[PDB]
Write a protein that binds this ligand. Structure first.
Ligand SMILES: CCCCCCCCCCCCCCCCCC(=O)OC[C@H](COP(=O)([O-])OCC(O)COP(=O)([O-])OC[C@@H](COC(=O)CCCCCCCCCCCCCCCCC)OC(=O)CCCCCCCCCCCCCCCCC)OC(=O)CCCCCCCCCCCCCCCCC
Ligand SMILES: CCCCCCCCCCCCCCCCCC(=O)OC[C@H](COP(=O)([O-])OCC(O)COP(=O)([O-])OC[C@@H](COC(=O)CCCCCCCCCCCCCCCCC)OC(=O)CCCCCCCCCCCCCCCCC)OC(=O)CCCCCCCCCCCCCCCCC
Ligand SMILES: CCCCCCCCCCCCCCCCCC(=O)OC[C@H](COP(=O)([O-])OCC(O)COP(=O)([O-])OC[C@@H](COC(=O)CCCCCCCCCCCCCCCCC)OC(=O)CCCCCCCCCCCCCCCCC)OC(=O)CCCCCCCCCCCCCCCCC
Ligand SMILES: CCCCCCCCCCCCCCCCCC(=O)OC[C@H](COP(=O)([O-])OCC[N+](C)(C)C)OC(=O)CCCCCCCCCCCCCCCCC
Ligand SMILES: CCCCCCCCCCCCCCCCC[C@@H](O)O[C@H](CO[C@H](O)CCCCCCCCCCCCCCC)COP(=O)(O)OCC[N+](C)(C)C
Ligand SMILES: CCCCCCCC/C=C/CCCCCCCC(=O)OC[C@H](COP(=O)(O)OCCN)OC(=O)CCCCCCC/C=C/CCCCCCCC
Ligand SMILES: CCCCCCCC/C=C\CCCCCCCC(=O)OC[C@H](COP(=O)(O)OCCN)OC(=O)CCCCCCC/C=C/CCCCCCCC
Ligand SMILES: CCCCCCCC/C=C\CCCCCCCC(=O)OC[C@H](COP(=O)(O)OCCN)OC(=O)CCCCCCC/C=C\CCCCCCCC
Ligand SMILES: CCCCCCCC/C=C\CCCCCCCC(=O)OC[C@H](COP(=O)(O)OCCN)OC(=O)CCCCCCC/C=C\CCCCCCCC
Lengths: 603, 459, 56, 174, 99
């Protein structure tokens, strides 16, 4: 037949296999994490094979194996789209997951439920694969909700932490707004096309309208934490560092960008939705970078960097460049996962300390971690020949040479400069200078698991963008001709951010103390958005839920109208009827009145 | 249908002639056997129903409800075993007799072929439920709950009886097949408006509809566990089945009279979800969630499109199973601590892991996690409502968000956090309780695997 | 003790015999609705050489 | 297997370009294909051969039920329950068959779009027109009849449409 | 005081008198056999047998029959050049409009 579909489905099945084995003594013992890691590595190789098959002849297939149910003229069946996006994203996700699982084997060694942690990680991976390979809207929604609820479970890993519980609930709330948008899109598509599958959707929607494309955009914004629905992603750092490295930054937050990429024909057909996507991405990346440049929690800094990169991807989608966004997704997955692993290594070595104000001296204290973090920050800022160069530089060049929003372009450039700035902040406050941690030095990073995982994600932060960009067919016309000052715009702004951040960090050694500014307070407090938008709407909704619906309507007026008024009327009438004194004279006079009335007024 | 009806009327003498320590075993075993026998009704045709005789017939809408009732009886028996340890033999046999009579009446109601017999049985179901509530409830408010339940139902249903006898006199027969084939349009006059009001209002009070729903929290909070299980899962579906049956003769007047009820149902979804957000009682939370789901089913039935009836049936079955499971979990927690306050007991995930897993699964099914039949029905209803109008999508989206909010809120409140220090009577979960939860949850996933069996006759 | 087993476990035949009786009654009711047997336009058919009723 | 009708499920002829390498490096795709054929395809082929040999030991057949044609609701008299029942059953069977026809056309359209790939907007325009015609006819026939649709309601809709068409034609050519 | 009332008894724990209790009955043998019959009948019989029975229920909904009929009609229609879907469900010759 063809070893393409068989091997793709085999990768999915072998991913699903260890979940079945969770009911066995292998799950009861302490070999389960290693078993899961081995399974993930084998899946990574078996997924590399179809990637080699695609890069030769560009083979793309769809498999509709199982027919679920036929709703009259609409057939829902289990269908997989093994196209370029799927066959390119599966190996990257499997590689990152393998590295994160080894890192978690090292990291969550003292956790009593490490087996359950690895089971949850594998379930998240399965749901993400379902989302990526889904061919119809219903299966895509299945994957969407699966990754959402797995994120909910893994954020609140420590059930006894109120902050973890509220972070998980907040993530669920924002993802449910995204799901509202997704359901709007699904309903419109079914109503106006009689199909939930991409083939018929693309065939019939030659000019996709504002309502379905806005539904898709809202779902993508909710999933990728764009402006308005962003705060859940920084708050999602309450979970263990492996969760932040694997789930959010690498593979889950790119779900909205991937969804917008999957509907790039419709996005091309529309213009207003493209403009809205561009503006949303620009404001998101600018705001998140501006918040990042002044944070003291390293995990939060990396989370805001991830949000800024997502905003850049959304900008790339808004300028009608779907494939550059996918390339950036892959490269960002690589170096962001490596950065999160390095931050987790630092945190673990310093006894669960997540403050750069207490980190210091780590350049010589932790050699390999320092090298890996430097390489990751160089790739993040767009070093001219690293993984981030083959995506970010092309994105900036395409934004410059486009009929786009001038404000959006300016905000994108400022966001790149701020990216360089917060990378400088992380490096300076974490590795340079003198120690600020407690005197008991427990620094030890000589674990083979940690070293090997960071090393594997480190070779992929140097030699992966080149291979990927040289092994993919040209899906877009290049921008060969451009002015010299526009060809090096990204480098100039990156160097300016480097220099300004370094100067402002060097000014902290002076024996001068000044109170903070309004701009500093705005930037450090996350723009005051979490405070206002997490206190006012919640208070008003929870107040109207009790004052108006429960007490005023249900407990008072709905009781007053039907049952209480009728009961009172019946009680009063019963009292009036039975209040007779039993006097024969009185009720015989009543008999006489009744007799007269019957005789006279009855004809 | 006699092959299913007679075994229940044999459950009665078996229960009354069994030994004192074997009543539960015999009742459970033979209820399971009757459920297995009733599974054969799922082999429905594609064009016309199964007409066994002049009195009983089975359809693609009746069969899943009959299977649900026959499956729900043994679970109620297990819960009764749980909470009726110290009762006397005669009172235990009376409780089992009430459950058996209720199941028999429900089976005959679902398989009745005429509207008057349907009404007679659908009103006959009131007596066992009222007796169970007002006799084996635990708190003082059970008498008030029984009064509210009985009088709401009767005030709803008496004009239905008047309308039914009037319809028979006018047309000739109340047989469903005849009134479907010989159906004629209903003119827009005051008399037709009031006949429509009689029938629809009866079934809406039974449903319930927002504004006519206080009896539901009153009865479900104060009823015993078996009463709550049967009230939420099956007795609420009598209104939906009746509306899906009675609307054949109400067109095209239904296209004009549906607006007040549609607005009431949608705003009631919103209001009851918001009420669920701020409830200090777990059973009240579950009851109001049931109200919201039934309001969604009302919206589907009133918009009355082929994609809305399938969603209505799927949502009815899924909600019945989910609400029964939630009530069972809440009853286990109550029996451990003897209080219905939600914030009284915490850390139950630390103290009882498997019950935490059951709570997680039940709450995930409640918030319509794909590809569960809850989500299937809700999505079909949402798509039909979107075709009807394009702001129903806004209302459904906000309702879905609040539903997820309160489901995860109750999960986090009960299971997560620091355990209460002074509560030291949390014994390990019983095999009976674990098996009850498993028997509640597995059929949901199996119906997810095979969804065409619960999508009604319009599939 | 065999009598005691019967004296205690004789109630376990009530539901099976009720099921058998219900099946018998269903067949007996079905035998009363044979007015259109082998007379419908869709399923009208000549009887086989060894056959007297299309269905029972 | 190809146990389906090619005319009912059309498929354009498959043109596969011949491999013309321009480099001396070996082909990992070719080597992996050889490995896959040696390790998977041959064992599954042997297993299928054994299973099909076992199936041919006892071969039995099943048939497609043929339904006779009966007079329809137009010929049925008013309040004639038996004829109305027969016509309603026939109409429901026809409705299901039409639904499956629409499904067949939609499957054709989806397969054509996926097959054409990057040039679908032009290549698979013949399936789009057939789907448009079938969808329009199906909508005109079984349009919004409601959840309680019936042959009588469909007949009433058709009569209304015929009256509207006749009035439009008269007011045009009058 | 207002009545000669019994004090509220303490709740009994089934695990105290029987550490192997399944929660069905306070009698050990009756509890064990109640658990066994519930598990066997319910899980094994109902779940497995009813699930496979429903899975292998005969196709009385005529889905496959409808698909085969649709294939036959499509083949006949497109072979002879006729439209795949007819314009009207009924025959205008048999339908008599009022005029
Ligand atoms: C409603 C407004 C809406 C605005 C929307 C638009 C927003 C635009 C944003 C523009 C960029 C903002 C930069 C960051 C601001 C916050 C800084 C901060 O909090 O630092 C603390 C934080 C360190 O905090 P810390 O170490 O914890 O200690 C804090 C101190 O204790 C205590 O800290 P502190 O408070 O003492 O230090 C802050 C101080 C020092 O920080 C700075 O000066 C940062 C900016 C550096 C200079 C940038 C411009 C100069 C370079 C470009 C020149 C033009 C080039 C043109 C050509 C380009 C192409 C070749 O800054 C100020 O006092 C005012 C800064 C005002 C910036 C302008 C935007 C906000 C205006 C708000 C109105 C009120 C202003 C007055 C303040 C409030 C009232 C009292 O600083 C950093 O981490 C580094 C910050 C600087 C990074 C600069 C990176 C590059 C920026 C872009 C350059 C251009 C790129 C190319 C663009 C495209 C060209 C085509
Ligand atoms: C009072 C304020 C009010 O009218 O609120 C309307 C509002 C519904 O919104 P809407 O769609 O604007 O109202 C109908 C349209 O204006 C106009 O709607 P339409 O033009 O489509 O015509 C439909 C109209 C056709 O008009 C008529 O049939 C007029 C003659 C009505 C005769 C009396 C009916 C007695 C039975 C009613 C239920 C008793 C329980 O139907 C009705 O009037 C049905 C009235 C009963 C609706 C169901 C109430 C259930 C209980 C609600 C909670 C109670 C606590 O709320 C209610 O109907 C419930 C009010 C509860 C107090
Ligand atoms: C079926 C499973 C039903 C629930 C579990 C019941 C048994 C149990 O307690 O298992 C835990 C327990 C784990 O052992 P343990 O450590 O001693 O237990 C302590 C904790 O309870 C251990 O608890 P844990 O928290 O560590 O994990 C327990 C697990 C147990 O929770 C669950 O399994 C929940 C699953 C349902 C979620 C809510 C409903 C949503 C709709 C899903 C519908 C899918 C239907 C598919 C067909 C199902 C047919 C049965 O919960 C989770 O993993 C968390 C939720 C994960 C959700 C994943 C995403 C769901 C949405 C997407 C699904 C997409 C599927 C289709 C894809 C289509 C395209 C390819 O399992 C066993 O011991 C298994 C042995 C006996 C199994 C039964 C007999 C097997 C042989 C025959
Ligand atoms: C038909 C039954 C009507 C019953 C009317 C009735 O008794 O109302 C109570 C009332 C008396 O109720 P009441 O005297 O208790 O009212 C007190 C009301 N507050 C406390 C708010 C000040 O009777 C009447 O109003 C007389 C109605 C006469 C008939 C009118 C027609
Ligand atoms: C392991 C983790 C589990 C949880 C997470 C889920 C992740 C996915 C797990 C998937 C496991 C199953 C995959 C393999 C499924 C094999 C069986 C399946 O293919 O058959 C289904 C069939 O399953 C059964 O139909 C489900 C039965 C559901 C009804 C059970 C009722 C039991 C009594 C309980 C009463 C409850 C009353 C509720 C109201 C009715 C679908 O029908 P179908 O493929 O075509 O049948 C093929 C036979 N044909 C070809 C002749 C047609
Ligand atoms: C249409 C559907 C509704 C749309 C949104 C309307 C407002 C939503 C109303 C929310 C109801 C509130 C229910 C309360 C549940 C519990 C709340 C709670 O847990 O507390 C707040 C909780 C956590 O508090 P923390 O800040 O983390 O404090 C931790 C301190 N250590 O935070 C929240 O979850 C509240 C978030 C509410 C969201 C409101 C903002 C959403 C509005 C933006 C929409 C616009 C999007 C723009 C994109 C457009 C794309 C085209
Ligand atoms: C067209 C040319 C380019 C085509 C794409 C080439 C992608 C190359 C990807 C890496 C090459 C494949 C290496 C195979 C590794 C898997 C082998 C394996 O299963 O394990 C062996 C072995 C040991 O595993 P343990 O976990 O330690 O188990 C110990 C057992 N006691 O695996 C290894 O560690 C090998 C070391 C890997 C070196 C680092 C490679 C870094 C690669 C970076 C880029 C890879 C990106 C992934 C795909 C890129 C395209 C999307
Ligand atoms: C319709 C035209 C005909 C006119 C006559 C109408 C008759 C039908 C309407 C009456 C409904 C029947 C129920 C009411 C009967 C009288 C109830 C009554 O006595 O009310 C007082 C009663 C006193 O109770 P006690 O036990 O004495 O003390 C404890 C106090 N909590 O107060 C109560 O709390 C009893 C609760 C009764 C409420 C029952 C719910 C009624 C629901 C009505 C729905 C709308 C009906 C439409 C008419
Ligand atoms: C509630 C308050 C209003 C209802 C009070 C009930 C008292 C009757 C008032 C309405 C009577 C309507 C009526 O008699 O006519 C309906 C019509 C009469 O027409 P004919 O004379 O036979 O022939 C046509 C003549 N040209 O008869 C029918 O349609 C049969 C059905 C009528 C039953 C009466 C309708 C009752 C109103 C239903 C409301 C239900 C409310 C439910 C209460 C819920 C409380 C929790």
């Amino acid at each position: 037949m063809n070893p393409f579909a068989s091997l793709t489905l085999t990768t999915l099945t072998i991913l699903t296999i260890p979940i079945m084995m969770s009911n066995s003594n292998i799950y009861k013992t302490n070999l389960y994490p290693n078993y899961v890691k081995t399974t993930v590595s084998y899946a990574f190789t078996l997924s590399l094979v179809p990637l080699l098959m695609f890069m030769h002849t560009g083979q793309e297939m769809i498999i509709s194996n199982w027919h679920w149910m036929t709703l009259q003229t609409v057939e829902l069946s289990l269908s997989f789209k093994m196209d370029y996006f799927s066959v390119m994203f599966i190996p990257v996700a499997l590689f990152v997951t393998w590295s994160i699982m080894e890192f978690s084997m090292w990291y969550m060694h003292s956790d009593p439920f490490i087996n359950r942690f690895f089971k949850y990680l594998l379930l998240f991976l399965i749901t993400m694969m379902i989302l990526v390979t889904a061919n119809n809207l219903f299966q895509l929604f299945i994957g969407w909700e699966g990754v959402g609820i797995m994120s909910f479970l893994l954020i609140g890993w420590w059930h006894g932490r109120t902050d973890a519980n509220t972070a998980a609930l907040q993530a669920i709330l924002y993802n449910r707004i995204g799901d509202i948008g997704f359901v709007l899109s699904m309903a419109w598509f079914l109503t106006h096309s009689n199909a939930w599958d991409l083939q018929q959707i693309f065939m019939l929607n030659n000019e996709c309208p504002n309502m379905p494309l806005i539904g898709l955009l809202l779902a993508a914004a909710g999933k990728s934490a764009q402006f308005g629905l962003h705060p859940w992603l920084p708050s999602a750092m309450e979970g263990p560092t492996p969760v932040s490295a694997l789930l959010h930054s690498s593979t889950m937050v790119v779900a909205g960008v991937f969804l917008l990429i999957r509907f790039y024909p419709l996005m091309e057909t529309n213009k207003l939705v493209q403009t809205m996507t561009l503006c949303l991405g620009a404001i998101t990346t600018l705001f998140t970078a501006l918040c990042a440049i002044t944070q003291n929690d390293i995990k939060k800094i990396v989370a805001f960097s991830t949000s800024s990169q997502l905003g850049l991807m959304m900008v790339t989608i808004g300028i009608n460049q779907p494939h550059l966004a996918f390339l950036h997704i892959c490269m960002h997955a690589f170096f962001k996962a490596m950065l999160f692993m390095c931050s987790g290594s630092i945190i673990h070595s310093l006894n669960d300390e997540q403050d750069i104000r207490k980190m210091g001296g780590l350049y010589k204290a932790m050699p390999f971690t320092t090298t890996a973090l430097i390489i990751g920050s160089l790739a993040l800022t767009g070093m001219p020949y690293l993984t981030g160069f083959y995506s970010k530089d092309l994105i900036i060049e395409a934004v410059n040479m486009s009929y786009t929003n001038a404000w959006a372009l300016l905000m994108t450039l400022i966001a790149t400069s701020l990216t360089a700035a917060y990378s400088t902040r992380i490096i300076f406050f974490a590795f340079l200078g003198k120690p600020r941690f407690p005197p008991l030095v427990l620094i030890n990073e000589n674990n083979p698991l940690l070293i090997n995982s960071i090393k594997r994600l480190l070779i992929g932060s140097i030699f992966a963008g080149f291979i990927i960009s040289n092994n993919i067919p040209p899906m877009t016309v290049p921008n060969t001709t451009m002015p010299l000052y526009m060809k090096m715009t990204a480098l100039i702004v990156t160097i300016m951010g480097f220099m300004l951040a370094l100067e402002l960090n060097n000014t902290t050694y002076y024996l001068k103390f000044k109170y903070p500014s309004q701009t500093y307070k705005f930037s450090n407090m996350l723009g005051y958005y979490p405070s206002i938008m997490h206190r006012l709407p919640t208070y008003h909704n929870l107040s109207m839920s009790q004052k108006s619906a429960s007490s005023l309507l249900d407990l008072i007026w709905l009781e007053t109208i039907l049952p209480k008024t009728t009961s009172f009327i019946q009680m009063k009438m019963s009292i009036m009827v039975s209040n007779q004194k039993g006097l024969i004279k009185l009720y015989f006079l009543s008999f006489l009145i009744t007799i007269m009335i019957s005789m006279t007024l009855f004809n | 249908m006699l092959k299913i009806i007679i075994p229940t009327t044999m459950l009665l003498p078996m229960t009354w002639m069994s030994k004192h320590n074997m009543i539960w075993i015999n009742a459970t075993v033979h209820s399971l056997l009757i459920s297995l026998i009733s599974l054969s009704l799922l082999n429905q045709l594609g064009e016309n129903s199964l007409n066994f005789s002049l009195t009983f017939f089975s359809d693609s809408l009746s069969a899943p409800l009959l299977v649900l009732t026959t499956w729900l009886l043994p679970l109620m028996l297990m819960a009764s075993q749980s909470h009726l340890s110290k009762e006397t033999t005669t009172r235990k046999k009376l409780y089992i007799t009430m459950l058996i009579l209720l199941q028999l009446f429900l089976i005959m109601t679902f398989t009745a072929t005429e509207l008057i017999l349907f009404y007679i049985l659908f009103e006959a179901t009131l007596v066992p439920t009222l007796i169970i509530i007002t006799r084996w409830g635990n708190q003082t408010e059970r008498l008030n709950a029984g009064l509210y339940f009985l009088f709401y139902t009767l005030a709803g249903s008496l004009p239905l009886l008047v309308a039914l006898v009037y319809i028979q006199n006018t047309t000739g027969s109340l047989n469903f097949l005849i009134i479907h084939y010989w159906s004629h349009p209903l003119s827009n006059s005051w008399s037709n408006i009031f006949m429509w009001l009689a029938c629809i209002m009866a079934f809406m009070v039974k449903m319930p509809l927002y504004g006519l729903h206080l009896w539901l929290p009153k009865a479900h909070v104060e009823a015993p566990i078996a009463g709550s299980m049967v009230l939420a899962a099956v007795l609420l579906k009598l209104g939906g089945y009746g509306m899906m049956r009675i609307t054949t003769i109400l067109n095209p007047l239904t296209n004009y009279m549906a607006y007040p009820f549609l607005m009431l149902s949608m705003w009631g979804m919103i209001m009851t979800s918001s009420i669920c957000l701020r409830q200090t009682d777990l059973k009240s939370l579950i009851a109001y969630s049931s109200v919201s789901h039934m309001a969604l089913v009302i919206v589907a039935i009133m918009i009355q499109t082929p994609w809305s009836f399938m969603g209505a049936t799927a949502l009815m079955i899924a909600h019945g199973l989910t609400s029964s499971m939630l009530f069972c979990l809440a009853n286990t927690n109550y029996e451990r601590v003897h209080s219905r306050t939600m914030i009284l007991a915490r850390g139950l995930q630390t103290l009882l892991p498997l019950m935490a897993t059951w709570w997680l699964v039940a709450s995930l099914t409640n918030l319509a996690l794909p590809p569960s039949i809850n989500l299937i029905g809700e999505l079909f209803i949402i798509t039909a409502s979107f075709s009807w109008s394009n702001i129903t999508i806004i209302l459904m989206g906000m309702n879905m968000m609040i539903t997820a909010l309160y489901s995860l809120y109750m999960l986090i409140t009960t299971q997560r956090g620091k355990y209460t220090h002074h509560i030291n009577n949390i014994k390990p979960s019983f095999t009976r309780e674990n098996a009850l939860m498993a028997l509640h949850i597995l059929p949901l996933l199996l119906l997810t695997l095979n969804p065409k069996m619960i999508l009604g006759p319009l599939y | 003790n065999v009598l005691q087993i019967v004296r205690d476990h004789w109630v376990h035949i009530l539901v099976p015999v009720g099921f058998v009786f219900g099946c018998y009654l269903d067949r007996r009711s079905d035998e009363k609705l044979t007015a259109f047997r082998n007379k419908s336009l869709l399923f009208k058919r000549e009887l086989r050489p060894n056959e007297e009723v299309t269905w029972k | 297997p190809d146990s389906w009708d090619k005319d009912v499920y059309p498929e354009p002829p498959r043109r596969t370009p011949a491999p013309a390498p321009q480099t001396s490096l070996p082909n990992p795709v070719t080597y992996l294909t050889k490995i896959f054929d040696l390790l998977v395809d041959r064992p599954v082929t042997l297993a299928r051969e054994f299973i099909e040999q076992q199936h041919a030991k006892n071969r039995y057949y099943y048939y497609h039920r043929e339904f006779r044609r009966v007079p329809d609701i137009t010929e049925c008299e008013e309040k004639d329950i038996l004829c109305m029942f027969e016509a309603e059953m026939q109409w429901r069977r026809d409705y299901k068959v039409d639904q499956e026809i629409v499904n067949i056309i939609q499957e054709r359209l989806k397969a054509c779009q996926q097959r054409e790939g990057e040039s679908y907007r032009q290549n698979c325009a013949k399936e789009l027109e057939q789907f448009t015609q079938v969808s329009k006819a199906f909508q005109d026939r079984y349009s919004d009849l409601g959840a309680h649709y019936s042959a009588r309601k469909c007949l009433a809709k058709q009569k209304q449409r015929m009256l509207a068409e006749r009035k439009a034609a008269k007011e045009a050519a009058a | 005081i207002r009545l000669q009332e019994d004090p509220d008894p303490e709740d009994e724990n089934l695990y105290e008198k029987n550490p192997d209790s399944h929660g069905y009955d306070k009698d050990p043998i009756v509890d064990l056999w109640n658990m066994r019959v519930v598990f066997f009948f319910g899980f094994s019989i109902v779940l497995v047998l009813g699930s496979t029975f429903v899975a292998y229920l005969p196709d009385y909904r005529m889905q496959e029959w409808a698909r085969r009929e649709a294939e036959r009609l499509v083949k006949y229609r497109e072979a002879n050049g006729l439209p795949l879907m007819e314009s009207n469900c009924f025959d205008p010759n048999k339908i008599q409009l009022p005029e």
